[PDB]
Design a protein around this nucleic acid. Sequence first.
RNA 1: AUGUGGUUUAAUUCGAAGCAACGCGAAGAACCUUACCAGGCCUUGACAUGCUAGGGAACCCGGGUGAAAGCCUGGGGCCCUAGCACAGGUGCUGCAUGGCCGUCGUCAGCUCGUGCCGUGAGGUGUUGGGUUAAGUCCCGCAACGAGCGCAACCCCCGCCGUUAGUUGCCAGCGGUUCGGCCGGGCACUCUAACGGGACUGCCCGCGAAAGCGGGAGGAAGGAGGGGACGACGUCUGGUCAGCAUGGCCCUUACGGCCUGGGCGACACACGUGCUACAAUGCCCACUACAAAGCGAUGCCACCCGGCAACGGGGAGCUAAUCGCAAAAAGGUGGGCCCAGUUCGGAUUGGGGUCUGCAACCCGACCCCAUGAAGCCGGAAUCGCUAGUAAUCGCGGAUCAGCC
Lengths: 97, 71, 188, 80, 29, 150
Amino acid sequence: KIRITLTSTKVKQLENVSSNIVKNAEQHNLVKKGPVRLPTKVLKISTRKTPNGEGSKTWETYEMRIHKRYIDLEAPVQIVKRITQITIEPGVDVEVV
Amino acid sequence: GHVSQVYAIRQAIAKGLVAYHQKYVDEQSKNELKKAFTSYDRTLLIADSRRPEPKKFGGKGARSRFQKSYR
Amino acid sequence: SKKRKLVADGVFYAELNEFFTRELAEEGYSGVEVRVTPTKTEVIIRATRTQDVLGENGRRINELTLLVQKRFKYAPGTIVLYAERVQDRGLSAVAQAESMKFKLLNGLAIRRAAYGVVRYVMESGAKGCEVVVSGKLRAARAKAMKFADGFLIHSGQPVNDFIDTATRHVLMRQGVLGIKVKIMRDPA
Amino acid sequence: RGMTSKPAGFMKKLRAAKLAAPENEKPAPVRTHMRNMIIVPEMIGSVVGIYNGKAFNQVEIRPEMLGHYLGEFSITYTPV
Amino acid sequence: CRVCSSHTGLVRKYDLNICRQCFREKAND
Amino acid sequence: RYANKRFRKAQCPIIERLTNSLMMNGRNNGKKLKAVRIIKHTLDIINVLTDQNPIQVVVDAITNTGPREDTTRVGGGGAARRQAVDVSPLRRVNQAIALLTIGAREAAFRNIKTIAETLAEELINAAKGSSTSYAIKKKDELERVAKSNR
RNA sequence: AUGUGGUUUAAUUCGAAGCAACGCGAAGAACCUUACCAGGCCUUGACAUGCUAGGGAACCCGGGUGAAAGCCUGGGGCCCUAGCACAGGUGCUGCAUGGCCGUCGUCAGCUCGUGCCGUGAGGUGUUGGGUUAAGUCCCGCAACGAGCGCAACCCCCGCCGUUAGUUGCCAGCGGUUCGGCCGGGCACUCUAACGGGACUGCCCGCGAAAGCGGGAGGAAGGAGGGGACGACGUCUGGUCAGCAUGGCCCUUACGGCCUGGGCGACACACGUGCUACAAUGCCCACUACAAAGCGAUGCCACCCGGCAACGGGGAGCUAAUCGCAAAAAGGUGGGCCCAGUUCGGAUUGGGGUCUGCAACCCGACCCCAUGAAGCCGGAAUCGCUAGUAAUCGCGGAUCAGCC
């Protein structure tokens, strides 16, 4: 039951990335759940532009929508092998349970 | 809230009525329940996009602006 | 990255950039991209003169890369050091700016130095370019200088300009004078 | 009014006041910003000047006075 | 904060920047 | 002026637009519900005390309340004379409804948990069946002012 | 309540000053913070590499004076001194500056090229008529076009669909410790990626045209709502007190530590606010709909002791799966009956909880008693054009606690 969480700013960067992981693991584990979408949350943050330091007076508003993708892979085995070396795109941050 | 729900339900019953039959739902949604040139009769068919409204700075409410005085 | 040490992970990058800018100046710094996974950070410094960076037969690249490890211990993790050549330094706003900033330090006619830079940039590629000099021109009363050619128009307007921007400072006995270089390239 | 089980008192004056205790008392005052402190008996007899924010007011503290804050003794607002 | 050392108001997470200013500054380029 | 006239959804009980307008006049703080209730309860009040159907009573009230002529100030060569003038049909309604609610609020009688009786009594008092009450006074007073300075 | 003027004070640290200073820097003043005041204390120096010379040289424990620093000194047993090379100051100057910010102003302008007019500076274009949020567009014209700007291209919110389903729900069936908990199911909500949709496109009216008015459909319109994008410049605008930095000034101190006081003073003046003067209301009870947020010694379920604040105990959560949380206005039933009142809660007496070394000066909270002014506000004056104003409650940053 290896839950994989793939998050990224770009929708494509994930579709590519998460898709790769689906195909690879297909080789040494169960058959993956398939890239599940998980809705995209947008965060609006109004804060000091910089951290405590210069221009505490500064502000600004930011909106950063972030995308997610689970594609769970139950019954693990040499999934790890196909996954470990295989990754590509930067712009993606993946963390696994 | 109960008010919001009243609107959502109102829309629901408006939409379902259309699926059952195109004919019944008329002008707001389909024909008479359905649509118009400009002003909305009831325009039950539309989903009121209105949302609370963010508070803009420099203004108390969002829209509401502080009044001026002789000061 | 990690909630706990995203900041820590970040501080290091500044640390790395700190040395590179100090050392690599002669080389002609343009940008320092930093990619990372675990204890193996990328750092691919871009330079006009890759030679200056590398050293002879790669002797300098060794020292610097080694210097990096001192700062980046095992905890930061060993890091590599890729270097790519900048095709046409003339295109890099950072360089173009630095280029002018240096001449100003020399005490060259600023207005002319500006024309030349716009010309060089304009001369090789670039759909449009513009250079801006701060004040205290010729150690004179603070002023501002301009110069531009080609459509910076269709740039400045955010819509996919792809305008490289760069600022370069210039310490001087008289005082600091900022330099701005804008280069317009094919839009998206 | 009981703040908690242990009465708080900042150490700046305490450590200072008590040292005076073995010699005896200290003539002249003391001066501490720490109006926040509660006064303890060792304080008695002493004269601690408290900070209005403007200045330090001489407050002789007597026994009836102990449970108090010290700040209670130095009023911040003046009619002036 | 960490870089500029402006104490006045640095976010903890970055724990950097002069304050919001450098945070915004670094972000800007 | 303020904006284009927005059309108002007719009243749920009696699908009369004018009624909704009246209700809007009553409401404050967007408490649309309390506002509707007060008007409805008043209508019930109109039913018991008076044999007539409330809808008719109200409409008649507004009619008595609408000013035909109003005086507006204007600067002539000397002093600002108050020129008498007709009132728009749109304007007359807003004034009538507004004046009713105000006069209604004016009434001493505090009946029903809310205002509802004052509205009920006010409307009847307005009717010209009974053309009295504070609302009508203002109306009569304005007209009187006009044509005074004919 | 709060900021300011002023006055007062040992000091009430500093700055900000018409719009664009005054709930402003302060998104957290009891000590701290803290820059002020009182008192105790600390010169090769609080830090760097080094020189000549006399001297005790590692080090460990006391006393005198003191606010502390420091100074003097007793003394078990690398370092001091003399001469030499060489930190700290929120102390002044924002008219020496960087940076950043406010502002006119989200406002409609500023120009070029060629042509044409003029001896020339320059003009024409960019003016005129209609229209627009707009130098926006239309018609006109010795002008014809163009560049920066406007608009558009980008982001968030409105409606629909495809893809994806560990979010979601019996929608739909079987079970239940009846918690969507279990199997199951992607429909729905949702999550995030992409696609559609609005263009005065269609209908009637006026117009030369742009377009103005009106109507239908539609979630939505005639720029649908909010951002990014605030131009060249103006104010010798604001900040050396965030930081940076030229120059000037202080170095037993214009530095540093500490305890205490002050920034919380008041005869008064003003700004911004809160609560309210009540019946479209107040109180008690019962009962119903939300969003966006935050949680490690942190949110605190539930149980117990207390009228209560809160204390004791303790589950889960590591947070779409647990907690903050109750939503308030609202609906239902009762009380009040027009009174300074079951309005209104100032002020004051007493008891007490909690944080914190410590709540006199000078914390918040609870319970009893007290129960003020206030019955709608002079001259004058402020906000807002729709999901806006008005009204109701909820969260957060700072943060021990909290004004």
